[PDB]
Design a protein around this ligand. Structure first.
Ligand SMILES: CCNc1cc2oc3c/c(=[NH+]\CC)c(C)cc-3c(-c3ccccc3C(=O)OCC)c2cc1C
Ligand SMILES: CCNc1cc2oc3c/c(=[NH+]\CC)c(C)cc-3c(-c3ccccc3C(=O)OCC)c2cc1C
Ligand SMILES: Nc1ncnc2c1ncn2[C@@H]1O[C@H](COP(=O)(O)OP(=O)(O)OP(=O)(O)O)[C@@H](O)[C@H]1O
Ligand SMILES: Nc1ncnc2c1ncn2[C@@H]1O[C@H](COP(=O)(O)OP(=O)(O)OP(=O)(O)O)[C@@H](O)[C@H]1O
Ligand SMILES: [Mg+2]
Ligand SMILES: [Mg+2]
Lengths: 578, 578
């Protein structure tokens, strides 16, 4: 609560803005002083400099130099802008050091398309306030206090009148402040959701063109713009209510300076020139009051923009803490009852319990929707179990720091996602070492990628492009297997890595992986049982429960379901010749 | 060329801005006139209204009402903002009516993750110019011309001097204009590329967390921010060069009004008060000159921002033109010498020629990297062939309008992409009809989806989230097959639709599809030959060439390769029991 406190804390966590802004403020206050000084000099300076010829020759250069001193007020502007930029740049670094550290559950919950716009399109709203309206506020406040002291030395009562009228402006501007806050929050939310929709539509352009939904999607993208337009005009329709109201307040103050002006008109007003000058300076003060009002409305709008970004920085990332660096990684992974559900109500794993042997092939097999890839996401500690935990040699897996547990496990996903860039920026990813270009090569050959990656310009960059769309549906899986094999991992985890590639490449990659990972522990999902018949252990997973565990022969002889699960399989290939 | 012409054309293609802006301009010019009028009245108005009390009682209300007429200058501001918003909103509709109409080749070429920022983060730069600096320019120009006529009626020569000095300001401000243009273009390009990088990183968060590349990716996201910061400070470092230079120009003009002032000081300067007033009004004119300079620099920056968006609107979309609405769709698709390459140099299809029979199953089978999905992208006219064309009943497929050709062909891709939203927003997509709930069902039951879609809260929305990540890798393929089966298509095209689902679901979906699509033409890719043994025709595709075409038995007996391609397959399943 008290939005100003968290906003200024979020700004003050961007430290190096703090230094030169003082110099900026000093230059601005001195420029404001010289602005207040110029007329008081210039009038009697005209009569004083009656001999313009002689005055301009020697002292006239002063009348030039002060002007370029006005030039050195421009510096203050640039100063602000530089410091201004640093603040928003600081903000982006904060968010980009938080977004990629939040646990994956936050990204299953919040769709990450929108948070990207939170990083890119929100802080650009914080730019305008810091860049201009802070200078506006400071010059306005100093000019107002100066004119206040002036009129105070003019009068003892009418200054009290205006200083009481000002609080009325505060209480009449508060509701517009709240409305600006609410409108800015909804507009920033709407721009975030719009960019999310558009980023989720465009990369799927093949689906749009093929389903013939160009028109429906243009409509659903137009209805998103129109909810910006209204939220981009209603806000304007509130800002217009700062123009009259402020003047309206001065109107009352005028009646005030008239009312007491009529009340004091016997003793006061004897120097009616004093009253006239009072009114003149009231005009001169109504200008900077408008400036201060613009700054307060912009502060409320900026808080309304960043009140959603002020909680992405409070989400508790979770990286290396225990530091118990893994030392063996060659132990059998034990699972004691390990139950887990993405949402807390429904359970997808109901007291699973298996023993992944060390240095052998264990195949998690089962019908779709059974909860296998979620079993790996448990086994790689993306999430954490709700029931009892995993162990290595009777030690819980929460005793080893995550950085020492993900640098030992090479995990090929069901999608085999690629990122835009080179193929040497996806075959080697995050490897702190310099790959040595004999290593990228042995890894690709162990994934049967060296054949197809030499027909193109090279390993060099067949820029895979966005989501690896410049490669096939089989070549990108081969590249993902290569990325997993490059790290020389102790525990391998293939989530159907031979899914979308043909039979020949399947046999080759199988031979290579079995030649390499002989002494290490491997866990493969086999959607078609022909590829894991030789596995050492099998885990039949159905509905989040491990129904049958054992070798292929004993399980198929003891498990009724899996036999059919194999038999139909056999039938098709047993039908191939006849 | 001549950037102002294309920019104003791009704005004028947003018509309904055009109307109320005239009212806005009239209100602004009248407010500028009353601003120029106020002092000339107010001085002798203090003298004439010395009554103090009698003037305020009856006529004093005028001194109030004109102030709220100042309030009705605020309207003009809101007017601009409203019209301002409409322009940028208009722009977004233009781009969103162009981006989803460009042929897919443009999206293979230009990564779409940057064009999304071109739509969302560029026009927000056009907002500031239209919202404020157009009013600034108009008031400044009118005030400058008024003061020019004033000083002209004061003097016949010194006004010529200042009107000659102004062109010097033009020629000294041109280079800053060009620098602002270049900096704005590079900054907009950099923000686009940054948002592209970030949108291609974040949705792959599992890959980042699992490859342990949190630190490398934070670094590659920080190096993107720093190239905004520099491009966001260098621009500021150019804007600061408008402050002094303009004043510097006035400096010369001062010497000018002094120089001829000394030249004419014999005849002129006899009314030295005239010279003093000339200098005073030169100050009063140096203010609006700064305003006009700000507007010109902002115009150059806005052109620098939109000079990349002014060509996305010139890319020649390609939708329904010939209008020869397809009438039969039950003819055999003939392929004449066809050849196609994504880039013009390398050919991926080298004179392919096949005959997809009408009402039968033709299976395109072949090793990965062979060019099958590109053969479908030819057969669905995403791209167009470079060699001879496709035909239906001896008629080229470029004789039928695309809208009548994509509403007849249901095409399941290799990725089976989903979009965030309901499952009833992906099982039925772009269908103009109301999709009864009995139809969504006889569809999702034909794809073996009715079983898993009832365990969850319902068809309603087990929101599949961004890229369908709230569903499995098999459930989303089943949903994609459902989306293809819902449209009741004459030509079906399954690009490995039974890839990532288990054997039982494979058999069920195969039985359902063979029960439904018996009278229609189907084309399936089979990566594992057990699923298309019963197909009527086979197309062995290797390296973009159709090596063997025929039934399974005759081809396997006549084609040496495919036999091994089958035999090894058999071996694994022939090894399953032993
Ligand atoms: C929230 C709406 N925002 C505004 C509110 C404003 O209120 C004003 C009250 C004034 N006191 C009572 C007369 C005077 C003098 C000028 C004002 C101007 C103003 C400033 C510069 C040039 C002309 C004017 C102007 O409006 O012309 C009048 C000289 C003004 C401008 C804006 C943008
Ligand atoms: C590109 C840099 N942009 C600027 C350039 C500027 O040049 C100015 C030249 C002037 N003529 C020669 C004296 C006067 C009078 C004021 C100026 C101001 C100015 C305007 C309002 C209040 C104070 C000042 C100001 O600088 O204080 C001086 C009164 C000013 C402001 C900015 C932002
Ligand atoms: N955010 C989520 N990520 C992954 N799975 C989720 C999520 N939310 C819910 N689920 C549930 O998890 C299950 C998918 O995980 P699972 O491990 O079953 O995939 P899978 O077994 O690899 O699928 P398949 O066997 O077809 O490859 C589904 O039943 C789905 O309802
Ligand atoms: N933008 C692109 N989109 C698709 N393919 C491209 C593109 N650019 C180049 N290609 C080439 O197209 C070929 C992939 O298309 P192809 O039809 O061979 O995929 P595929 O045969 O379905 O792959 P698989 O058989 O493994 O599923 C690759 O050789 C690749 O080099
Ligand atoms: Mg492919
Ligand atoms: Mg799955």
């Amino acid at each position: 609560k008290s939005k100003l406190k968290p906003f200024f804390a979020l700004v003050r966590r961007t430290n190096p803005s703090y230094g030169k802004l003082a110099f900026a403020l000093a230059l601005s206050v001195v420029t404001t002083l010289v602005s207040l000084l110029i007329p008081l000099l210039t009038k009697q300076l005209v009569d004083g400099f009656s001999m313009s010829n002689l005055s301009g020759t020697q002292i006239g250069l002063i009348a030039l130099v002060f002007f370029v001193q006005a030039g050195l007020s421009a510096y203050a502007t640039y100063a602000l802008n530089y410091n201004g930029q640093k603040i928003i740049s600081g903000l982006r670094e904060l968010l980009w050091k938080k977004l990629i550290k939040l646990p994956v559950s936050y990204f299953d919950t919040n769709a990450s398309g929108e948070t990207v716009s939170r990083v890119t399109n929100d802080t650009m709203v914080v730019k305008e306030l810091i860049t201009t309206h802070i200078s506006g506020f400071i010059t306005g406040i100093i000019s107002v206090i100066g004119s206040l002291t002036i009129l105070f030395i003019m009068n003892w009562k009418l200054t009290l009148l205006v200083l009481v009228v000002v609080p009325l402006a505060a209480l009449i501007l508060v509701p517009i402040g709240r409305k600006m806050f609410s409108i800015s929050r909804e507009t920033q939310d709407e721009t975030a959701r719009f960019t999310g929709l558009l980023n989720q539509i465009l990369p799927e352009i093949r689906l749009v063109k093929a389903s013939n939904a160009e028109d429906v999607e243009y409509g659903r993208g137009k209805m998103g713009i129109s909810s910006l337009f209204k939220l981009g005009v209603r806000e304007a329709k509130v800002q217009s209510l700062v123009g009259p109201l402020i003047s309206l307040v001065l109107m009352a103050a005028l009646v005030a300076v008239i009312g007491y002006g009529g009340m004091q008109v016997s003793s006061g007003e004897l120097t009616a020139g004093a009253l006239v000058a009072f009114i003149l300076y009231l005009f001169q003060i109504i200008m900077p009051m408008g400036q201060i009002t613009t700054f307060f409305t912009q502060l409320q709008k900026s808080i309304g923009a960043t009140e959603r970004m002020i909680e992405i920085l409070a989400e508790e990332e979770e990286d290396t803490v225990t530091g118990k660096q893994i030392e063996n990684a060659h132990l059998p992974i034990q699972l004691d009852r390990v139950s887990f559900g993405y949402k807390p109500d429904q359970l997808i794993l109901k007291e699973v319990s298996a023993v992944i042997e060390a240095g052998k092939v264990t195949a998690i097999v089962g019908p779709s929707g059974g909860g296998k890839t979620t079993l790996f996401k448990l086994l790689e500690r993306f999430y954490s179990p709700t029931a009892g935990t995993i162990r290595l040699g009777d030690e819980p897996v929460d005793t080893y720091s995550l950085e020492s547990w993900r640098e030992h496990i090479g995990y090929v996903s069901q999608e085999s996602p690629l990122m835009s860039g080179t193929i040497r920026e996806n075959i080697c990813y995050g490897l702190e070492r310099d790959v040595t270009d004999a290593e990228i090569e042995k890894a690709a050959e162990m994934a049967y990628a060296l054949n197809f990656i030499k027909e193109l310009p090279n390993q060099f960059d067949t820029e895979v492009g966005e989501r690896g769309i410049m490669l096939s549906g089989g070549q990108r899986q081969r590249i993902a297997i290569a990325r997993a094999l490059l790290r020389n991992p102790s525990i391998l985890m293939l989530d159907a890595a031979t899914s979308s590639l043909d039979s020949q490449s399947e046999k080759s990659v199988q031979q290579a992986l079995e030649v390499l990972m002989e002494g290490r522990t491997t866990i493969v999902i086999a959607h078609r049982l022909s590829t894991v018949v030789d596995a050492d252990q099998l885990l039949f997973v159905e509905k989040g429960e491990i129904t049958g565990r054992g070798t292929h022969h004993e399980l198929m002889a003891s498990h009724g379901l899996y036999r059919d699960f194999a038999e139909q399989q056999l039938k098709m290939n047993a039908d191939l010749e006849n």
